[PDB]
Amino acid sequence: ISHGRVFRRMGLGPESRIHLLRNLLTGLVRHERIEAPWARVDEMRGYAEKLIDYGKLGDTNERAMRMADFWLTEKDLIPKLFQVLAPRYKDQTGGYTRMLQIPNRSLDRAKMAVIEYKGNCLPPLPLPRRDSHLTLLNQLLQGLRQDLRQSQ
Amino acid sequence: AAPKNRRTIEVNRCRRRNPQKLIKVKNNIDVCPECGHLKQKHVLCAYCYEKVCKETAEIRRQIGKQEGGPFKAPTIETVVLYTGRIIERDRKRPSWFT
Amino acid sequence: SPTELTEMRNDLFNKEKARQLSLTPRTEKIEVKHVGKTDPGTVFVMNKNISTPYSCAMHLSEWYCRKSILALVDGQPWDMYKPLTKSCEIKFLTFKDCDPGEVNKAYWRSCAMMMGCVIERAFNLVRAPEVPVISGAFCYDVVLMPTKENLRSFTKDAHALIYKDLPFETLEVEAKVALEIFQHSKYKVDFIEEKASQNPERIVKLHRIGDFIDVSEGPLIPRTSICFQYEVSAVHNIRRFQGVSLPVHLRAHFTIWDKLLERSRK
Amino acid sequence: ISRKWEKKNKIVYPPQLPGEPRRPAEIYHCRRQIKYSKDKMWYLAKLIRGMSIDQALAQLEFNDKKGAKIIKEVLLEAQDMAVRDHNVEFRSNLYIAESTSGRGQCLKRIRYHGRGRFGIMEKVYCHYFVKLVEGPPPPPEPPKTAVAHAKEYIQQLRSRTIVHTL
Amino acid sequence: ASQVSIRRIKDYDANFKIKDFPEKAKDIFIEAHLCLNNSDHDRLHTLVTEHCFPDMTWDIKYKTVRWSFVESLEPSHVVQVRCNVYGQITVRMHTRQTLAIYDRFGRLMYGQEDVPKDVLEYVVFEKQLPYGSWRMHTKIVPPWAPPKQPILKTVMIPGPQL
Amino acid sequence: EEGPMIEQLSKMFFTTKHRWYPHGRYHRCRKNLNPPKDR
Numbered sequence A: 001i002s003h004g005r006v007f008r009r010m011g012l013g014p015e016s017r018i019h020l021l022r023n024l025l026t027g028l029v030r031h032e033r034i035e036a037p038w039a040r041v042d043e044m045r046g047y048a049e050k051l052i053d054y055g056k057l058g059d060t061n062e063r064a065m066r067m068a069d070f071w072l073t074e075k076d077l078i079p080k081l082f083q084v085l086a087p088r089y090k091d092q093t094g095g096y097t098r099m100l101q102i103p104n105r106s107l108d109r110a111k112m113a114v115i116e117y118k119g120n121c122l123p124p125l126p127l128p129r130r131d132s133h134l135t136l137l138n139q140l141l142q143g144l145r146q147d148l149r150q151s152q
Numbered sequence B: 001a002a003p004k005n006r007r008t009i010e011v012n013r014c015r016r017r018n019p020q021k022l023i024k025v026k027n028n029i030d031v032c033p034e035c036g037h038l039k040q041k042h043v044l045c046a047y048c049y050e051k052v053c054k055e056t057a058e059i060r061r062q063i064g065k066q067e068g069g070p071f072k073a074p075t076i077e078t079v080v081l082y083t084g085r086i087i088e089r090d091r092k093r094p095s096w097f098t
Numbered sequence C: 001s002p003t004e005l006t007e008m009r010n011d012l013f014n015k016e017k018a019r020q021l022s023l024t025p026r027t028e029k030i031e032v033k034h035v036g037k038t039d040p041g042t043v044f045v046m047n048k049n050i051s052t053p054y055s056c057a058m059h060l061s062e063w064y065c066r067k068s069i070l071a072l073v074d075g076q077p078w079d080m081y082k083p084l085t086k087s088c089e090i091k092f093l094t095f096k097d098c099d100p101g102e103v104n105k106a107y108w109r110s111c112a113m114m115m116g117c118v119i120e121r122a123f124n125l126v127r128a129p130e131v132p133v134i135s136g137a138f139c140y141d142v143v144l145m146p147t148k149e150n151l152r153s154f155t156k157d158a159h160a161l162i163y164k165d166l167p168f169e170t171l172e173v174e175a176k177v178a179l180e181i182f183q184h185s186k187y188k189v190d191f192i193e194e195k196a197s198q199n200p201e202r203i204v205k206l207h208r209i210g211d212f213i214d215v216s217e218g219p220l221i222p223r224t225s226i227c228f229q230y231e232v233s234a235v236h237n238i239r240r241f242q243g244v245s246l247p248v249h250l251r252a253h254f255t256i257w258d259k260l261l262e263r264s265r266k
Numbered sequence D: 001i002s003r004k005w006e007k008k009n010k011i012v013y014p015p016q017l018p019g020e021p022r023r024p025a026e027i028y029h030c031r032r033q034i035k036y037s038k039d040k041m042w043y044l045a046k047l048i049r050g051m052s053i054d055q056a057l058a059q060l061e062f063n064d065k066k067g068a069k070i071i072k073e074v075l076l077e078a079q080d081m082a083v084r085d086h087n088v089e090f091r092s093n094l095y096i097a098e099s100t101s102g103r104g105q106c107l108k109r110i111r112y113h114g115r116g117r118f119g120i121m122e123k124v125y126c127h128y129f130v131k132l133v134e135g136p137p138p139p140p141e142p143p144k145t146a147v148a149h150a151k152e153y154i155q156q157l158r159s160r161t162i163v164h165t166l
Numbered sequence E: 001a002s003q004v005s006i007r008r009i010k011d012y013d014a015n016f017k018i019k020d021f022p023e024k025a026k027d028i029f030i031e032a033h034l035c036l037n038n039s040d041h042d043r044l045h046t047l048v049t050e051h052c053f054p055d056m057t058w059d060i061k062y063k064t065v066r067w068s069f070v071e072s073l074e075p076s077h078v079v080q081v082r083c084n085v086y087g088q089i090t091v092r093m094h095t096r097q098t099l100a101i102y103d104r105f106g107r108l109m110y111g112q113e114d115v116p117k118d119v120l121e122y123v124v125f126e127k128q129l130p131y132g133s134w135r136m137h138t139k140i141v142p143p144w145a146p147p148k149q150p151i152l153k154t155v156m157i158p159g160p161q162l
Numbered sequence F: 001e002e003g004p005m006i007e008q009l010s011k012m013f014f015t016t017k018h019r020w021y022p023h024g025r026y027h028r029c030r031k032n033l034n035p036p037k038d039r
């Protein structure tokens, strides 16, 4: 039984799992993109968002700083987190982290995934579009909407 | 425990040629509207994703070159300029970076 | 008479086709290029009055065949099954492009034609009106009161036709020939004349669905099977019959479909 | 070691009369000594069987299995052959008539078991076979209706005799 | 130069006359084409050289051709001749030739069986000078003849893949 | 639809389900296509 039970069981224990998560987070901070196995990626994203929120609170808060220290192993990244990422997302609330599939990893045939903080500096991912508005069904829908508007 | 008699070939066929064990004929597959190389729904196009990855790698290399050793990570949002903080590539811009 | 007429028209069409075939001297070859966002920069070495853009599609893959509907050759829409005269540049058009307006119109035309066909058997046809997509229907004007049962029957007929899965045969013909074909129907004749007047070449565009034949301005969709959800909404007083229909590649789903139908009904 | 599949591409059927059905292009191709188990190959083969080349290719692309890649490669090669050497005009018009897996020559090794004991590992190989035919993939079995069943039953009923007497 | 070559050939052989040669050449050609229909590699090799044999037998493999011959236009002409010791003659030919190339399965991929077409040829012959003979070496694709017969099947030419 | 169809058939003809279920390949191969017909 495992009803209402968040947190997947990643490494060789919970500490290990946490460590793994941290590494991923660090990588993300460094890079602003990671190819990683999809099951851990979501966890990372969850943690990542929280981390960014924490960073937003500002350098001067000690708790936040401590958290940053804990989670960013490479240490140069803490300034980046404070003096860049936070600045970038001051307007947003929790839209950060964009998480999409990758075909499949070649050797073990795992489910894979990408994880970028939103916007960022790298070439854009080939995102899944919605169908264009000029298509038949869409056009019909638009017409219907117009009619409704006219009625009211 | 040990098999008391040899499993007959007919039986075996029935067991292992049954529709639960046969590979399903999937219907996720659509054409890649840019690039045309064919891809799954819910997944990034493999070919389309490849170019992007390559681009990232080259940009990464350039970044590395710029930032001498490890432990740098500066306080500027970087930009990638091709031919007219800054990272200076080369070539024309592709028909997707904008 | 309706038993004679259809056969006669078909025969005429066949004759015309034969005549058309006659002109080319034993397999004349042309090099038709593919302009496109994907699979470039291919060229297909085709046989000119026989081979269509469907052949080209086939050469490329099966996917193209499945999803292509109009073939922009030198920036003008050919039908998938209408032959490629001379060396030119092809693009294939789906429902799901950035600019799918040409396709939509064609689809509408096809739907109208289907409706007309349904009408002709079920029991004189003036024209198919040039209706947009935002107008929320494809209509067809008919000179002769129908109940819901009648409508249902009509719908069923349409469905049957779709199932039968007939290719939309195409010809660009002399005006005289067209007149000869439709001399019994006056409105049709008038329409043909108008069309002739419109262009410098007389070049009347005849389209055919097995037994049924009709005139129309634009190109048409390859086959009737591309229509998936097809219904006949209502008739309004000449009597304009209306319809709304969504293809494979854009399925509406129940509630949405119902809404669409309702909209059409107005 | 025998190889008749390879040979099969070297047949010459005597030429047709004008008033005669087209006679579609059959095309045979293999891969020998693939490192895989035959039964595993068989599932993939089964998955491919009735399908158009293109559809089969698509399926293979997204089937995450070692052998799938190999089969895809084989299919591609077959397609190429058809277009070049075997005078098939449209790639899209090729469907897979047959696909089967034979066992290749297998190498015996020692497995080294607990206690003093040991098994003999057999390192397995396969031959993958394909036959492509020209023309669209034939329509599958339409599942026989109640009516058909009834008809059959009626026929059966009719068919009986008085058995023994005369 | 041609005259000199001829003289040399005469000296080599020795008995040789070019007044009758064109006809002989034509006959040889005809024989070769007949052989091609019947797939006689045994017969072919007495005609046609080791350079030309593989050039006219590789493409045509597993596929049945249905050649025939009819009324040669103009007389059989002989243009330039020249000369280890392996000699060379060139022959101009203007004939009516039927061509019908059928595939492994049957079918028909090149030309009409019954309808004869009028063809131009610049056929080069060679000979070894102990037990040699005059055999075909090359077919010179000049002057600038009006293309070929067009191919029946449609073709796709793939562009540069990326 | 299968089971329902079978049931319907049974109802029609008064018989058990077991005969309407389709028998295997071997058995069909065995069956004589050109039996010796008499009278």
Ligand SMILES: [Mg+2]
Binding pocket: D115, D116
């Ligand atoms: Mg020991």
Ligand SMILES: [Zn+2]
Binding pocket: A126, B032, B033, B034, B035, B036, B037, B039, B045, B046, B047, B048, B049
């Ligand atoms: Zn793509």
